[PDB]
Design a binder for this molecule. Structure first.
Ligand SMILES: *[C@@H]1O[C@H](CO)[C@@H](O[C@@H]2O[C@H](CO)[C@@H](O[C@@H]3O[C@H](CO[C@H]4O[C@H](CO)[C@@H](O)[C@H](O)[C@@H]4O)[C@@H](O)[C@H](O)[C@@H]3O)[C@H](O)[C@H]2NC(C)=O)[C@H](O)[C@H]1NC(C)=O
Ligand SMILES: *[C@@H]1O[C@H](CO[C@@H]2O[C@@H](C)[C@@H](O)[C@@H](O)[C@@H]2O)[C@@H](O[C@@H]2O[C@H](CO)[C@@H](O[C@@H]3O[C@H](CO)[C@@H](O)[C@H](O)[C@@H]3O)[C@H](O)[C@H]2NC(C)=O)[C@H](O)[C@H]1NC(C)=O
Ligand SMILES: *[C@@H]1O[C@H](CO)[C@@H](O[C@@H]2O[C@H](CO)[C@@H](O)[C@H](O)[C@H]2NC(C)=O)[C@H](O)[C@H]1NC(C)=O
Lengths: 215, 106, 51, 221, 172, 172, 172
């Protein structure tokens, strides 16, 4: 089957600049039937371009497709806040129809450091046998951040999951939550709990901690 | 074996009815209206200079009726004369009123 | 607001060639006609799919 | 307005079946085809297949050839997609999109349904437990929140002060734990000063489990 | 129409062709497909646009106007004012009605024409390797894969290549 | 005409066809005959009627009229009355003349068209079993009795049945 | 055009045909040549002349005229005189613009038509001894010397004479 390859997977650009997205196909796309779709979070894809250069109705002149054969490009001439979204290409030339994976355009911003907070487990939750420690990184940029957990200064692995928000409407920042999960036993077994955040906007790594059973 | 190549045109679910030489009502895919049938209901104050004459008739503002005094040295592209208008000054009459009003309004 | 064509009913847009609003006008204004609708066909004859 | 209306979210255990519906309106239904496309959470688009509401033709991706059958019903102007022998990786959002009436045509997927989420899990329904994330400052700006843990299936609603609190709030996407239950945290940033005066209540609503819960957050010294 | 193609020997329209005014549907060994034809679609569109602009251009009437409404009955002069305005309005109404009619008849005939031209063009390309079925479809008497179909749609189709196969298939 | 069928490649009209506008004359083993074709005759008639009604509909002018005749010379106002009426009359005369011309040219072209369409239709039906003689007559290369002729006139003619006989007769 | 012959399937015009509007270029064993076709050239010319005369005939306006210029401002009556004249002038300007447009569109379509008719006529004459190349040229499948070419140009060409040679050349 035909292999659609989009690059690069993420673009950071500022509104008013021009975005250029690449789609290469493992082999020649028959008829140059290649479409571009746009998907915002939570919504369904929209058809942007078909036939590789042709705009689906209700679409601006600023969004335009180009290219042929193996090599295709989607261009956006003036970026408006509604254009920041994920873009997919697909080749409908043959069966099976195939999509590239997820080129995402996002808002370039002044680097901004995360505000870090650390929350101990609720006693109520301890009642039920499990301890959850939460580390919150608030309103930063860019999205890349490293959250490392330390228990009695032991670097943890495998016991924490993390979730990230979507670039904020107003300040164009991200937030992130790391959650460490323990059996009550293992929890009360140690004392110092710490969360060490490395980010592009911190001259050096910030650590936020507590000691279990303190005030 | 062989193959079949078929020529065709497009269509829409609900078309529009138009008039032709030979048909009073016939359905095409799309049409546009050539008669402006509607108004916003209000007179736009650009580009033309619109002088709202309020309770004054242009002749009253000509003559200097007191409550019309706001109009001295006024200019206009379109002078809008209202129905609520009236004269509070010494009563008068203007032979060929229409034409005086006309040449002044001009 | 901005409208080049003024009638006593208020302003009307002059994009169209004809207007049914008022025979009294001021400014560049469509020619006044008695008809309230005239449709100009911008597409071919519509022949819906049989089924 | 060329609308494609898709059926409700489904929850199925492995081995089961699912049949999803798409009700088309605003165009002549037998003049087009319909194509089914799925997207797993935080993943790309995968084309399942195509069917002509016109001549009844059918094209399936080799992958789904076996487990999937597509149908259409002309009197209801409705397209259906049935998947059999479900595994858990079949969990995704399923979209139904309008396509040309013939396969090797020249345009593609011009109108999209809202999509319907099919969740394949052996986990039985459960409501969320809600614990506080309590603020403490080392006279500044402080953070607090709610940990909504161990529920199923998605979604969950979360609000603050019954909607009265918005600015500064972040509700993170759910994460799916090993147990098979989801969890997520909601978080607010507020002035430390208002900490001692104003009350903070988080309202969590889990529709599928028929659960509505309200918790509050205080430091406790 | 005048050329009897649209609502003519062409049975009906394809509502599922959203990418053009005119096009080809095909059937061959590989399957069946539907593709628009840009050149003719644009021919028709360009004509209709030109027409439209010709109609909505610089049509605005600008000069000083007489009094078109009167409060009190007068006599001669006003009777005349009214008469002038009524005459004017009637003439303009007539002009409008006629314009719309001629224009529309023409628009229909012209689109019909485009369809028919695209058809005659296709046939002439196919030369002796196909027959005109009469519904606006050609029977192609040789095996034609997708590449070949495209070659007909894009004008580069070389009939001499398939002539022998086709003739052999037609005449025995 | 525009299509060059009537007073075109069709030599002349048949005054002895009193039952229609268009038709077929045939010659075969059984004899010769002349029959009208209702579908096209009615196509043309319907169009021309529609046209006629469009022209004679709601064309009456109704509003209060000024004085159009004068006994004694006066001056300005009357000179103006006369001028208005003369202008009106000239514009309307022009409208009438033009209308009649456009309309008539069209009527002729449209009838021509109908003839030509009926002809192309017949040919397309005959497929490969006949040749176009150039005068508006087809040579049918197989034996065609009255039933068969009728089958062509009524649209149900199946060419595949006579194809072999006809081809055999054309090419040797 | 409407028939898509001129600026149609006919690639371009021949500036070196100074002796006619339409014609034939030929290539045969003897050489190549270019000759006008009088009948159709005159058809078109006669039509366009008729049209021209219809347009420039008896178009002059003759009746007593009001005062169309004024030195001093007056009032009602003059405002009315001006209004009448402006209305008149606008209506006539419109009539002129429309006339020219309709007329011209028609002239173009009609000439296109003549070309196409001459073409269809030629083809029908050639019968089965030639094929339509699609650019407005016929391939003649038998040896045709200058006399024969002329026989096609002057309408006396007898296809039955060359039928065997031609068919033999086309189908093997
Ligand atoms: C069926 O009918 C519709 C009208 O009833 C057609 O819509 C029109 O299509 C034409 C040709 O494409 C457009 O003309 C273009 O105008 C743009 C810019 O125009 C500006 O104003 C329009 C109208 O309000 C607005 O839509 C634009 O955004 C602009 O603000 C030019 O840049 C182009 O060069 C071109 O001339 C008309 O604008 C458009 N009208 C409307 C109301 O949309 C429709 O296309 C018809 N359907 C088909 C497929 O034939
Ligand atoms: C009109 O039609 C023909 C065929 O069209 C084509 O088939 C379709 C299904 C699509 O897949 C089209 O992309 C494909 O072109 C066109 O002729 C084609 O031209 C292209 C580009 O020059 C050829 O590509 C070449 O392929 C060879 C090997 O096959 C390579 O070595 C070359 O590097 C080169 O890329 C293509 O082969 C050729 N198709 C065939 C089968 O002959 C034509 O270009 C098209 N349009 C016009 C207006 O010319
Ligand atoms: C614009 O205003 C005029 C009146 O100022 C409207 O014309 C009147 O319409 C009513 C209802 O049809 C009639 O009874 C009157 O006799 C009309 N008056 C005159 C003098 O014609 C007209 O309808 C308005 N146009 C729009 C569209 O708002």
């Amino acid at each position: 089957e035909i292999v659609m390859t989009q690059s690069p997977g993420t673009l950071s650009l500022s509104p008013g600049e021009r975005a250029t997205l690449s789609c290469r196909a493992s082999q020649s796309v028959s008829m140059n039937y290649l479409a571009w779709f746009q998907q915002k979070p939570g919504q369904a894809p929209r058809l942007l371009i078909y036939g590789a250069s042709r705009r689906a109705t209700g679409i601006p002149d600023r969004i335009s497709g180009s290219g042929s054969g193996t090599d295709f490009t989607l261009t956006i001439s003036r970026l408006e806040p509604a254009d920041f979204a994920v873009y997919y290409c697909q080749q409908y030339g043959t069966s099976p129809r195939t999509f590239g994976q997820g080129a995402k355009v996002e808002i370039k911003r002044t680097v901004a450091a995360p505000s870090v907070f650390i929350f101990p487990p609720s006693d109520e939750q301890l009642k039920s046998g499990t301890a959850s420690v939460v580390c919150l990184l608030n309103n930063f940029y860019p999205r890349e951040a490293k959250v490392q957990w330390k228990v009695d200064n032991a670097l943890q692995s495998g016991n924490s999951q993390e979730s990230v928000t979507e670039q904020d409407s107003k300040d164009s920042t991200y937030s992130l939550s790391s959650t460490l999960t323990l059996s009550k036993a293992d929890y009360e077994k140690h004392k110092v709990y710490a969360c060490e955040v490395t980010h592009q906007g911190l001259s050096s790594p910030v650590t936020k901690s507590f000691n279990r059973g303190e005030c | 074996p062989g193959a079949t190549l078929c020529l065709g045109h497009h269509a829409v679910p609900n078309g529009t009815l138009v008039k032709t030489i030979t048909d009073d009502q016939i359905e095409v895919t799309n049409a546009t209206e050539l008669v402006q049938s509607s108004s916003t209901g209000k007179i736009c104050n650009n580009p033309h200079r619109i002088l709202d004459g309020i309770d004054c008739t242009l002749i009253d503002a000509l003559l200097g009726d007191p409550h019309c005094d706001v109009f001295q040295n006024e200019t206009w592209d379109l002078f809008v004369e209202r129905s609520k208008a009236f004269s509070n000054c010494y009563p008068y009459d203007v032979p060929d009123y229409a034409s005086l009003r006309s040449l002044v309004a001009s | 607001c901005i409208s080049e064509c003024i009638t006593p009913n208020g302003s009307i847009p002059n994009d169209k060639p004809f207007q049914n609003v008022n025979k009294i006008t001021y400014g560049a204004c469509p020619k006044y006609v008695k008809q309230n609708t005239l449709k100009l066909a911008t597409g071919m004859r519509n022949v819906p799919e049989k089924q | 307005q060329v609308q494609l209306q898709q059926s409700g979210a489904e929850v199925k255990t492995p081995g089961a079946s699912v049949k999803v519906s798409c009700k088309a309106s605003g165009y002549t239904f037998t003049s087009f085809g319909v194509s089914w496309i799925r997207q797993a959470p935080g993943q790309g688009l995968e084309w399942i297949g195509w069917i002509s509401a016109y001549n009844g033709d059918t094209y399936y991706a080799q992958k789904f050839q076996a487990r999937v059958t597509m149908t259409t019903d002309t009197s209801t102007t409705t397209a259906y997609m049935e998947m059999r022998s479900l595994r858990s990786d079949d969990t995704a959002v399923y979209y139904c999109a309008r396509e040309p009436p013939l396969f090797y045509s020249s345009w593609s997927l011009d109108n999209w349904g809202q999509g319907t989420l099919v969740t394949v899990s052996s986990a039985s329904t459960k409501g969320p437990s809600v614990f506080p994330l309590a603020p403490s400052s080392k006279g500044g700006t402080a953070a607090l929140g709610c940990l909504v843990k161990d529920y199923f299936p998605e979604p969950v609603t979360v609000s603050w002060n019954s909607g009265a609190l918005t600015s500064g709030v972040h509700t993170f996407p759910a994460v799916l734990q090993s147990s098979g239950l989801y969890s997520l945290s909601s978080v607010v940033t507020v002035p430390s000063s208002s900490l001692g005066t104003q009350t903070y209540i988080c309202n969590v609503n889990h529709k599928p489990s028929n659960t509505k819960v309200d918790k509050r957050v205080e430091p406790k010294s | 129409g005048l050329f009897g193609a649209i609502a003519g020997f062409i049975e009906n329209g394809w509502e599922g062709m959203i990418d053009g005014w005119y096009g080809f549907r095909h059937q061959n060994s590989e399957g069946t497909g539907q593709a628009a034809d840009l050149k003719s679609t644009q021919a028709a569109i360009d004509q209709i646009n030109g027409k439209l602009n010709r109609v909505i251009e610089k049509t605005n009437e600008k000069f000083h106007q007489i009094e078109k409404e009167f409060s009190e009955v007068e006599g001669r002069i006003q009777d005349l004012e009214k008469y002038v305005e009524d005459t004017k309005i009637d003439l303009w109404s007539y002009n409008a009605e006629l314009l719309v009619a001629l224009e529309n008849q023409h628009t229909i005939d012209l689109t019909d024409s485009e369809m028919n031209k695209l058809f005659e063009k296709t046939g002439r390309q196919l030369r002796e390797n196909a027959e005109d079925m009469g519904n606006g479809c050609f029977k192609i008497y040789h095996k034609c894969d997708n590449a070949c179909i495209e070659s007909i749609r894009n004008g580069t189709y070389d009939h001499d290549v398939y002539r022998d196969e086709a003739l052999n298939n037609r005449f025995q």
